[model samples]
Target: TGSRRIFSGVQPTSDSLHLGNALGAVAQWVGLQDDHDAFFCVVDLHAITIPQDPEALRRRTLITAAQYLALGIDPGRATIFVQSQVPAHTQLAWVLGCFTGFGQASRMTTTVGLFTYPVLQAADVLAYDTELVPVGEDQRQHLELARDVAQRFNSRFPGTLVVPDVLIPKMTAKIYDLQDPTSKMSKSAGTDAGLINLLDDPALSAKKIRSAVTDSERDIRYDPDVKPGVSNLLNIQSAVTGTDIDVLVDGYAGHGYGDLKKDTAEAVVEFVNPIQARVDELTADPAELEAVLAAGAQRAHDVASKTVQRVYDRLGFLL
Candidate 1:
């Protein structure tokens, strides 16, 4: 309805999204579909920062797309597709990279996996003429870089790219790992025991939640500084239940940690059960999922090609 187009991407590094990823990211994306012209992308290209088996990467890309659909990211309302499907993303990245400062790029943790990927992400957002990018706190720097590169290019070659703004989902911005509580939840964690995968058996999901770490404090309060573990649990509960953190803390005053963890686990399980069911149904027919992605790629290509062409013409590249 609004022209404030929103773009977001998730890496296809894991077969199924974790509970953190689902509630912390995908849920927000689903809610934004009706309000903004949204583009939900399976960022396969970004996954290459680490070594990947080509075949497994392809399979995981499709599976990730399926999970997005199952999680309520409507292909009809949102532009849902694989990142690699649109070639202009990389094409524009090359141009944007030239504008990026080498010192700034190098300062960004020189790992091949981390440094080169954000530029590609910039291309991902700018290619679709997106006006707003919904990103987590960890990815905000990359969004800032994208805005800078877009501005630099626009200054040099006027009207070549659309500079986008960042939109952070503050309430669910950062969902910490269950085991560590201090670390960000990730697919590449040392063990999957603590991760609550979307496709995980409901029993296993419940088990992980039950075993999640919490301080020995008698009161179930949201004191993040003193009790990070308990605070994290409270945060998860708040996000899933759509309840206020302060209010939740008051309700649980003088309660034991056991009940808090147990109820949090139950709330998480109930939240993801329907999403898992939908994923199961979508994965049942792989061909239909592939068709959806293919169609989305075609739509993405139409817009991306025009952006790339405009960049080329602006920079005096021969047709």
Candidate 2:
């Protein structure tokens, strides 16, 4: 389907998408506005895979949402809403379950759920009549499952759901941790030490960058094998500053790691400056934030209602 209708999500499991997500997901998603009819979701429903504190969960959801707006997801253009707000998402997925297997919905109970996630994920894409699901290499298999499940439904329900294609990019950066430059940046780090949260205090972010583990060699250059730490810094600087790695490395020639660290730290602050401000401003008025999401939800609900209605009617629901 070449509808340019796209859907992508990020879980509100944490307050921010981190430096890696900034370079990886957010950067990719920001530019798709002109060509695509996009839908952005804070996948709150997926966050409850483990038990959560109601208060913290609520806070993180709003923070995550504000981050979306802050990171350039336009509420005026794209549909931006919480996953749980659109009840029909899982409703369509549940119908898919009966069609799939002894699919008692083994795990990821609808009451609480998507990594078993892929099945629920399938439900998410198919329910909205999604045309292109922008996924990366890691999620390609999951998108395959969406296609498989959609094919299953099409055969049974007479083309009620659309099989979405992947919006794979030519090249995407692989961001590593600050403390441990070898491993991919993730939620679990040696401490909050290495993880660079988009919403972290700018000073703290600068501190993290300054503390980044560069190799013993003083020469600044990009070498992942011999000098992962310095290379990680180069990647960070390049990502935030829009400068190329080789360019940054060349510029840093004859420079000490301290100079590289300082510049990178400054780059991190400069990069996140406005995002932090917008998160504060957008979230300042609870009513307005709620309003934006509500509007998006209504739009999403309207579209989803039609698709679900078609499926329900075909499935022998009294509709």
Candidate 3:
């Protein structure tokens, strides 16, 4: 409880967490769990901003949570719960909405949910009294909004919320598409060929890596601009294997592109092998998984509901 509290969530929009998500975000989350009071959420609520299949959404929520554990988020140490499982999140969002300007909401540019997305995001962060948020550049504006709302609320009701700072990792790796190395690896990409999904068959994932695009240059290097595909592979290898890019490059001086691709593929496969096994076991035992989520939800609610009550009390609401 004395440790800094951090909040982060990944939407359950995909059946599996891709390479980008694993290396870019969750990997950092796993590292922070040792020293931080962490809350990792399967943000099913956020997924409905767009059309989503009901069945798929429900299944994906469990799968997403399972992958979080498989990827090394110790559930006992980190509160891993489904976002919608805790009603205090929405309760706090409704309160924060009152503080948000209508003009700002309009510009946030919707389904009313889409327009109010940032406020809900703010609720997600503030409900936990989060002091730190690990987020990418895309969510910078939303974090700013959360900070502004927290500051304003605190002004009106002193110490009402924890205005969080974005935690920027010193060695964060920005993982990109393997096939289209210039583009961010995303489920919405024109093709899945470039994406290495964590839950995919190991052979399939390895095959994608093998087929990854690379420049004609024979020299192995980390120049992303000149050799984006090769650089992407190096980044992936470095991220998963815990090897520095320069170190990898130095060793590959006499090797060819095929060698790099082969090693990178193997590195990724080896990294995800045990994770995939753990996920399989977790998903196979749904009752246990549900129990974990239930426990996490209860724990998360204990903290978040207090924040919501404080907000309501400050707003002169009857207890």
Candidate 4:
């Protein structure tokens, strides 16, 4: 009944989502709820790409789900579930993996992070019959690989898997780290100071924002090449306030970098304070969270089971 269908997931690899995840990805997901039939996943299976403490990983998975809710992913509107809870994802992934080329898979980024994880992503998108897959520039290759696998399967068994198109938003898409403007913000970064965690205490998040690196020149402009730090600040400010960077730069042509940083910190705090509150409330009740996940898993199973059964039948395999 919806005009758009989307499937996107985030790994439960960190206790809190970094600013990059919030501004670059989660914000987009929240905005899309109005127009799209969306499915949001806490991809626990993908977290196994690298070694994880089993207990910590379990805790993080639920935290990740709670954060999603706090960030305004309406569970009633979007299908939200843990990846492993819906068995069909892995089952279909195995079938899709058989069609995927070994050499091709090997040629992919080759990190344990890439090799072991992307197939699960392929399953995540394909299982939902996603029409548009929102990915960062870095993830274009993986989405392409998913499209390839889908097309191959579709050819082999006509009218089966729906091929998904890559959707990359042009503006405000990639948010760089505050300390290292050249690098994208990530939870796995070597230093924690450079990252802004969504569920971090407002005071801590403010500190990170204030201490963010900027160039020696006090000019408050958006020239990324000459002023990466300042540009990054402008970008962060713009994203938080929904103002255009160029417009912001012109408005504050002779403003001090200190002022910019202070305002940016305030904006970051305002944006995340309520989200942190909601997350705290949700995490406080494990039983209710589990019930929500259980319901999501049941709904996911109902949809995915039918598709997996069709694939199994088309492949002429005895069950």
Candidate 1: misplaced stretches above 4 Å? 110-114
User: Which portions of model 4 show Cα errors greater than 4 Å?
Assistant: 110-114
Global local distance difference test of model 3: 0.88
Q: Which candidate is the best by lDDT?
A: 3
lDDT of each: 0.83, 0.78, 0.88, 0.83
lDDT of 2 by residue, 1-319 (tens): 2257888877787767787766766666778855778887887877888677899888888888788788887777687888898988888778776665544334222333433566677777777778887654456666776787788878877777888987764224557788888777776565888888998899998998889888787898787779988888887788777788888888887899999989988898988999999888877877877888899899888888888899989888998
Candidates 1 and 3: which is better by lDDT?
3
Clashes of 3: 0
Tens-digit lDDT string for candidate 1 (10-122): 98887888866776778778888888888889998898888788988987888888888878888778888999889999999888888889887776643655677778889
How big is the positional error of residue 268 in model 3, measured in Å on the Cα after superposition? 1.0
Positional deviation of residue 207's Cα in model 4 after best superposition, in angstroms: 1.8
Off by over 4 Å in 2: 99-115, 135-137, 168-173, 216-227
lDDT of 4: 0.83
Ranked by lDDT, the better of candidates 1 and 2 is 1
Error of 2 at 200 (Å): 1.2
Candidate 4, residue 80: Cα displacement in angstroms equals 1.0
lDDT string for model 3 (116-233, tens) is 9899999999999898998654577888899998998899999889889987543334577888877878888878889899988888989999999898889999897799889889
Better of 2 and 3 by lDDT: 3
